[PDB]
Amino acid sequence: MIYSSDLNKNLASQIIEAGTPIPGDDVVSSLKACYQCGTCTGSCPSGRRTSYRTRKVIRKALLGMDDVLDSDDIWKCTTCYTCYERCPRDVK
Amino acid sequence: MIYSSDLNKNLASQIIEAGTPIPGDDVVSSLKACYQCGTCTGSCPSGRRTSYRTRKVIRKALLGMDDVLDSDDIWKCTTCYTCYERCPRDVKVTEIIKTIRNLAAQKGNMAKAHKMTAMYVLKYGHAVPANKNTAELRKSIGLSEKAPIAQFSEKDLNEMNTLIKELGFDELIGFDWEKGALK
Amino acid sequence: MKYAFFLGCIMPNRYAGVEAATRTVMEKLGVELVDMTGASCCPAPGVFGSFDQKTWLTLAARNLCIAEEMGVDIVTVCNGCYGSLFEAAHLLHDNKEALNFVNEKLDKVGKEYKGNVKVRHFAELIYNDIGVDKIAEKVERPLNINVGVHYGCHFLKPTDVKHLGSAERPVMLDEIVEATGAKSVPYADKMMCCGAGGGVRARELELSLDMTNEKIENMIKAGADCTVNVCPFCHLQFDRGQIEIKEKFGKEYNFPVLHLSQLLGLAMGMDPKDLALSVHQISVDPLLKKI
Amino acid sequence: WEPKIIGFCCNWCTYGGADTAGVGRMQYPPSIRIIRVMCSGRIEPSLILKAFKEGADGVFVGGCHLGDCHYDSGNYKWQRRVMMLYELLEELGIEKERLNHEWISASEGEKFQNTMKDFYNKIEALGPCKLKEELDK
Amino acid sequence: EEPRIGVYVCHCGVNIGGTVDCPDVTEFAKTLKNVVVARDYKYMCADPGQEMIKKDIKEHNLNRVVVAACSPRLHEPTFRRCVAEAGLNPFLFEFANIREHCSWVHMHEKEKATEKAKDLVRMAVAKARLLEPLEFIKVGVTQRALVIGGGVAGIQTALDLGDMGFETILVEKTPSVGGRMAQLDKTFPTNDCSICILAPKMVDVAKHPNVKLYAYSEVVDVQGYVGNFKVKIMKKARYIDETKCTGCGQCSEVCPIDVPNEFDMGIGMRKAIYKPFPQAVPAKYTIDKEHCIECGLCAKVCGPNAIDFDQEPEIIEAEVGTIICAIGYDAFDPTVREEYGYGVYDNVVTALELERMINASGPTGGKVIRLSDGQKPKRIAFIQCVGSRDAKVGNKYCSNVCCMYAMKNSQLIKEKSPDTEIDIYYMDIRAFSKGYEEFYERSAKQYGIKFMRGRPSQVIEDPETGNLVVRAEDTLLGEILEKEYDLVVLSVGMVPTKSADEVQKILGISRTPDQFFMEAHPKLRPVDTATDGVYLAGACQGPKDIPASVAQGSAAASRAAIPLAKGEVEVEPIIASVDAEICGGCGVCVKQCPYGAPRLVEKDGKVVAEVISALCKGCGTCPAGCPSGALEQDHFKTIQLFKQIEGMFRDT
Amino acid sequence: TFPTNDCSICILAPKMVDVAKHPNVKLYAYSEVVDVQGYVGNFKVKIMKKARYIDETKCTGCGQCSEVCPIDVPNEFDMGIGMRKAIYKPFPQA
Ligand SMILES: Cc1cc2nc3c(=O)[nH]c(=O)nc-3n(C[C@H](O)[C@H](O)[C@H](O)COP(=O)(O)OP(=O)(O)OC[C@H]3O[C@@H](n4cnc5c(N)ncnc54)[C@H](O)[C@@H]3O)c2cc1C
Ligand SMILES: C[C@@H](OP(=O)(O)O)[C@H](NC(=O)CCCCCCS)C(=O)O
Ligand code: SF4
Ligand code: SF4
Ligand code: SF4
Ligand code: SF4
């Protein structure tokens, strides 16, 4: 059960402000263009051996789930850029 | 990681076969009409306090994941029919869950507390039989000490025993008639 | 009106006062309750239907045959038995393959279902055939208290076969309890399950209690003095579940629970002793003081 | 043995309802053979009695919903004719159930499918109509 | 001359051939009396298939042709034209339906389907033997069109027909033209002001020299056939002098009866005397007698004394050649989905009600506010597919525009108040046309609109605050959400308009499973109906957006302009006629015809019946009811039908 | 073709036949518009009737020729999945 009280509505905008001006407002604001296709998760080498699902991290950010910052999952990304290369919605 | 080798292509057919002719081929075949909207999960009272997600149970049946039969989740449904009432695709959800449980029971996934409730109907003819306190209560209330039920009628108790043996329900729950208990 | 009175299990073997309350309330309304001799478990639809559907329908049709041999229809005060026997009757009338399978099994015990039995719930029988006006006429002691009405699940659902109207916003029971002088208080998730159904009470007790606790909390927040039901199992879950909620969660409510027959009985001047309100795990005495 | 069922369907809403069942791949038993007329008002006792004479085990008639006839009121005349015909068939020893008339619109493909299933099952249960055999003596 | 029949069994690729053994049916057809040629081909309607029939008609001197294939409702005209090109009369052609009526419905019973196809071929061959050559009746076409419904679709048809030089009549039920497009604030995917772009077309159609606009009028009767329709239009009485009406609106202030404003979807309150919207065309006021108490208070304030209760509706008789039905749609009533609480909770509204709340000329002055306390909502939830893709409400179709209008209105709210939080609860986002997917991307990326994949189970109101809680599973997370909102917007689907039943009976047209009007063919004829001279345009044919409705309006103009431009059309001579030597004038036939075609007359010193050929539509009711057998419908004679019945059991 | 699952030929072939023999339609197959000059109501167009190397008025379209041709060209109509001859007909219902 997830209630409104457990969510931080400005998490997406907060992530964008932390990215302005480095790596850039346009770069991080691309998280809003995500249409949850799952191409990033399927491309993830870490996802194939852990509970880490790249798509769910973006979902958790857009929804406002606070735990994403406390999670161990965001630290399992090796920054291989494969999801960045294959995203059909240009999500950086 | 889920590979083709881990999936059973006939899972849906096998569930539909188990539902034929009771509750009906058309009733259980409705599982094929599910478009994974999640209305059933959102309506589920059990889902709000457990990891049980009604939609995922239907998804497993359609994908071919046999573990759904071994899951404790299918046994968390109270059969309230709320999902059945709200499904926009006419999926007879509650009936499909009961049908998936039948296959689970045949595999040996039946809780001990359930086999005992099933044994009470086989042994006494009722899930909740009368005890010494029932007799003394009914007496003080002004009712017949023993209700006109199968519990106190050997004719009706033997009728049910003949049906249970013919249906193979005694073998399903693993009941031994000589010992008068479950194996 | 003459009907074969199906008793079930919990009402005849646990909450006997509900039986006594029904016997007099239905007699006062002009209903002749005839004994359905040898009737066994319905059997429980959610519990047995989950183990083996063939067994649920075959045993259900065996009970229907008892009333068919008597040449009369069935009446029940339990949603579990209503749902089980009603869905069995519908299925045997609509599905010939199912009827053939069941009659082939009943032939071994010298029985055969012909499809002449109609299953009725005492609450809807009161609403559609007797009338809510007849309840008010027989009220000797008006019960002016707040009630959290509990419809249960197998009373109105599935609507496709029951045809008793809306299952989301019903008025049937609210109008029946309000005819006694009481007030049906609106509460959150009014139509949700008590948690006992589908064999959940027996296999996942704590899960069933979590749902009952939410219903009790919502009724208490709405200003309810008691809760009225139409199911011996819901009645058991609310009345005895509170002892388990106190032993497992540590939450105490002492919330009174009255079956519709018991509520109609109190209203029709029945003596609390004849009604058996004192036997309840949770004391009804606080409610008896309010009336 | 398989029942021999003959059908009479109007070209506007009913024939169109049978076509909808076909477009939607709505399967039903293959006993019926449909005859096309412009309106159900074209249907009269002589065609139904002629079908039974020829050996039909069941006769089906389909027209527009009452009030929706393409020709305004042809189905009202057929409705009066079929009610008389039901009782005449009983006087001739032909089960009333061997004749079936229904109102089906162009949008009712599912209804047509279920009507075909129900009528087939009804006639299969009754068995063959022995009129032709009695007349061939 | 004895019949020489040519039997053609189509395979339709594998549509027929895959279930029915066509070669075996072809061999069986050859065993029938009079059948001299029998062939099976993959596509009988294709060039090689049509040329094969024509070549055989000439080489084997055939006088009858039987095609066992699809439905005559689809290709009967196609094959009639094919046989006529080879010299064979088109009424000596007979269709046997073995696809829709056999191969497509008996897929798992191939042998029985093959035997059914043989019987259907024998039944066709049996009727074919007694078919007679009939002369297609040539009739003139009245150079005038009629458009029913003055929405964007109807306005487009009338403007196109008018611009072509054809006299056109546009009938509009309400006091103003414009339709639902006039009620919208903006229009996706361009977010253009709906009325600001529709108003010019409303102005154009109102002053077009070739278009006669009858607003606040209804078609009450239509009689005849293609090119010869006789229509009756009821010009409803506004009880206000049309010419003396200024359109200022000062007599409404005194009216004591408050009627819910239909234009504002029940949110607003109007008087018995009113104007639909500020940009209405024609700009005039009206009195609603369904709620008028006739107190005369409005007349005391009115200067012109335009108010006249003795006004009578005028019945206008007009002759037209073609008719275009463009009556639109109505929004679905979401009261039925009780779990959502519409009609129970104050803050649960429909999307069409939101359009009005958002519209500047609306009841709230263009301000989105809660109906419980009049406050602006800070959190809004859109619930998709309400009344669509739902078997429980009997609507198993996609309403086509709800995904797009929910995203559009969400952008309009964000533009007015960026702080607003908006969540859209969906199953599939359907942004299928030009600039639609981009509009969807923009809604999320530019406007920060959130999407939750999951159809809500229920909506729960907090009785203390009026706030609503949406219970739904976030299927993309496998978790249940229970988010709170200040306003819940139900993205209601489209349903046929309330008057659709009346119009259906008047035009004699059919409906599709979705309850909208049935087109002749989904791809061969999207705006034609099976009724010659009657066409469709807009939402009344099925749920769709503005460009689709506008394109359909133009498509209908072109199709309806064909008979008008030709000036002559051919009608089926399947009419009834009396054999004077057998008719003894019993008079049974006279009252059976709803058109009054059969009439009693004097001939050779005695009374006999006679059918006025032009008034006969060819139903076959009077010949079926004739007790002497004097009356017969050509092409459906009793002897022809008798042989068809015999054909099911034996060769006749 | 969806959603009726009719053959594409069911709807298209009769229309192809109709347009080829319509008295008011001049069909220029295997041709391309190479130039357009002017404005609304006054366009001057140039159509290049490509050479098929077969006399259309004398041709029967029997295809005895295709059975003798020895060179195999990938059929563009079949998306390279099919093999046609130098002397060809796009499809059987062409
Ligand atoms: C909430 C909502 C938002 C939408 N947003 C958009 C959008 O942003 N962009 C977009 O392209 N589309 C949108 N649509 C779809 C759009 O409304 C339709 O495409 C459009 O209205 C179709 O026009 P129409 O002429 O076919 O029917 P209508 O607009 O409904 O007009 C029909 C006309 O016929 C009249 N009429 C009815 N019955 C009779 C009768 N018996 N006799 C005479 N006249 C009659 C009516 O009074 C009406 O004027 C939206 C729809 C809804 C419900
Ligand atoms: C009632 C109670 O039994 P006891 O009162 O404990 O004997 C209960 N049994 C069951 O759940 C048996 C199934 C009863 C089904 C009733 C359908 S209304 C239980 O074990 O908790
Ligand atoms: S690939 Fe891109 S759009 Fe698709 S889920 Fe991943 S981040 Fe979102
Ligand atoms: S960049 Fe990170 S999240 Fe993306 S595929 Fe590589 S490891 Fe996975
Ligand atoms: S509500 Fe119906 S369609 Fe939706 S996920 Fe559940 S079973 Fe499937
Ligand atoms: S029937 Fe079962 S799955 Fe469906 S809502 Fe009730 S408890 Fe949940």
Ligand code: SF4
């Ligand atoms: S009725 Fe009279 S007051 Fe009203 S708008 Fe017309 S002219 Fe003005």
Ligand code: SF4
């Ligand atoms: S006469 Fe009719 S329109 Fe005029 S004020 Fe009275 S109620 Fe209103």
Ligand code: SF4
């Ligand atoms: S267009 Fe979108 S919201 Fe509308 S019915 Fe289709 S999927 Fe549902």
Ligand code: SF4
């Ligand atoms: S019903 Fe037949 S006999 Fe009688 S008047 Fe008409 S045509 Fe003549």
Ligand code: SF4
């Ligand atoms: S067949 Fe007879 S009843 Fe029918 S339209 Fe013609 S004349 Fe009228």
Ligand code: SF4
């Ligand atoms: S449309 Fe009719 S004639 Fe043409 S291929 Fe399909 S079935 Fe055959």
Ligand code: SF4
């Ligand atoms: S051989 Fe080839 S070129 Fe000659 S007529 Fe036949 S198809 Fe045409």
Ligand SMILES: O=S(=O)(O)CCS
């Ligand atoms: O417990 S059961 O689901 O079988 C019936 C509840 S009334």
Ligand code: FES
């Ligand atoms: S046209 Fe169908 S009944 Fe008259």
Ligand SMILES: [Fe+3]
């Ligand atoms: Fe403007």
